[PDB]
Design a protein around this ligand. Structure first.
Ligand SMILES: CC(=O)N[C@H]1[C@@H](OP(=O)(O)OP(=O)(O)OC[C@H]2O[C@@H](n3ccc(=O)[nH]c3=O)[C@H](O)[C@@H]2O)O[C@H](CO)[C@@H](O)[C@@H]1O
Ligand SMILES: [Mg+2]
Length: 471
């Protein structure tokens, strides 16, 4: 106790042991287990840098400039012959077993009110498939496409990053469903770290008398987790050369998109980000920018209202390159990143954090009472030697699940609506006849991105809703 107290008090966190006399021996052991999981020197060192307001005000007066339209291309503007070239390059890499996916599934947002990892959400499709199952079947299908073209049945290694409260339920969900037709050996779970939650005076919250308040350390915690969980070793052993990192909530996600992988390989990019066009200033998307001669993403929470609402001569937003958390990393760049993730800025967010008050009572604040600190995955972009930005069509590739339906944006209903609208488009683009009032869902096992539909829908008329086109 004495050595533990000193470690705490030398860093001003001695209050965490306040309730020691009232705790059972098991609660005492739980509390001590919480404390030994925290490096109080590194945490306290990190908090000071993250909350150095003088440096923050300097970053606010930076001459923030958007990525010029001249520095990126848009997939829908490419010729179909250039698209095929990129797709075939990506399909070859997938077939050769050189592609992995880094699924960011440790996020703990509560906005949705879902008592499970977000990946288990069912937005009410005719198939009633979850985000996890849809993504798994997209992996199945694109592996099949790659093997059918190039012979070898290469596998995408699915690296699923979890946090403490998602690790168990996520592994249980995939196991219960027989990995949705994928092989268990190719799905690799790894767990990101956490950081404690602080009040406005820099003292760490107690979630219970025997439990320190903590939260996942941001999706920028990927890099440290990759190293200390042995994932970089696994990547090197498997011969994986390309990594597709993306969020869990985008129901339109082109997992291991061969066009994306082929595009970045052909441009010899060490790192890349997909973007969509931002048309409302308040959309909660980061924007790709240039400052001091390198690329950056400024999170929606850190973009001034002035910059967000600034307009071009056209009337487009000046900052219109909307990040959709959909990134490419070369294996070489990834392993070099993980050796300097220490320098990665910690971002501060005001949050409503439950806490034990000065009277042993757990409160639930109605106004933000504390701070969480997060590393952001895109903060490595400024260290890339050949960063590439690739614009994609929003209706084909981005529809985020963030809020409940009452918010009416980025909700289950818009996610389900965006996917069904896209599949209606795929059916029409393959020669099928279907009106907007018909809900036709295309199984990912039948079509990854609109291919493989002519023989089934060309000339056919779809008049009954809902309809499920299956494999
Ligand atoms: C990548 C990032 O910093 N912000 C992006 C993110 O913000 P946004 O704030 O919407 O999302 P979060 O950064 O909270 O989470 C993004 C993804 O990372 C996962 N996650 C998050 C935190 C964590 O500790 N562990 C973890 O695995 C989430 O579960 C999800 O898979 O998505 C938007 C698009 O939808 C982009 O416009 C934002 O620029
Ligand atoms: Mg991102």
């Amino acid at each position: 106790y004495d050595s533990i107290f000193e470690n705490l008090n030398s860093h001003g966190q001695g209050h965490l042991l306040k309730y020691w006399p009232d705790l059972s021996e098991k609660e005492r052991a739980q509390l001590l287990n919480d404390l030994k999981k925290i490096d109080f020197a590194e945490v306290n060192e990190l908090f000071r840098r993250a909350n150095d307001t003088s440096k923050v005000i300097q970053e606010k007066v930076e001459d923030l400039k958007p990525i010029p339209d001249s520095h990126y291309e848009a997939v829908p503007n490419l010729s179909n012959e250039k698209i095929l070239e990129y797709e075939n390059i990506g399909l070859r890499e997938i077939s050769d077993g050189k592609v992995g996916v880094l699924l960011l599934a440790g996020g703990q947002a509560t906005r949705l009110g879902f008592g499970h990892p977000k990946g288990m959400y069912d937005v009410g499709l005719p198939s009633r498939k979850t985000l996890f199952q849809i993504q798994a079947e997209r992996i199945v299908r694109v592996q099949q496409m790659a093997a059918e073209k190039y012979g070898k049945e290469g596998k995408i290694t699915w690296y699923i990053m979890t946090s403490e409260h998602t690790r168990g339920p996520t592994a249980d969900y995939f196991r219960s469903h027989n990995y949705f037709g994928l092989n268990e050996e190719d799905i690799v779970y790894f767990e990101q770290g956490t950081l404690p939650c602080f009040d406005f005076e820099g003292k760490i919250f107690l979630d219970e008398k025997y439990h320190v308040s903590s939260a996942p350390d941001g999706n920028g915690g990927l890099y440290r987790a990759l190293k200390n969980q042995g994932v970089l070793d696994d990547i090197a052993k498997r011969g994986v050369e390309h990594l597709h990192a993306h969020s869990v909530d985008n129901i339109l996600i082109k997992v291991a998109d061969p066009v994306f992988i082929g595009y970045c390989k052909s441009k010899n990019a060490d790192c890349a980000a997909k973007v969509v066009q931002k048309s409302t200033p308040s959309e909660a998307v980061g924007v790709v920018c240039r400052v001091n001669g390198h690329y950056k993403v400024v999170e929606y929470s850190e973009l001034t209202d002035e910059a967000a609402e600034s307009r071009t001569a056209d009337g487009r937003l000046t900052f219109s390159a909307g990040n959709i958390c959909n990134h490419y990393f070369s294996s070489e760049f990834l392993t070099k990143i993980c050796n300097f993730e220490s320098k990665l800025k910690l971002h501060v967010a005001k949050k409503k954090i439950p806490y034990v008050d000065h009277e042993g009572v757990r409160q639930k604040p109605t106004e933000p009472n504390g701070i969480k600190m997060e590393k952001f995955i895109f903060d490595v972009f400024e260290f890339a030697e050949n960063f590439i930005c690739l614009e994609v069509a929003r209706d084909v590739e981005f529809s985020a699940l963030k809020n409940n339906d009452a918010a009416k944006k980025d909700c289950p209903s818009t996610a389900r609506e965006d996917l069904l609208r896209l599949h209606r488009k795929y059916v029409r683009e393959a020669g099928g006849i279907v009106e907007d009032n018909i809900d036709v869902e295309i199984s990912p096992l039948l079509s990854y991105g609109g291919e493989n539909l002519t023989d089934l829908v060309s000339g056919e008329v779809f008049t009954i809703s809902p309809y499920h086109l299956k494999s």
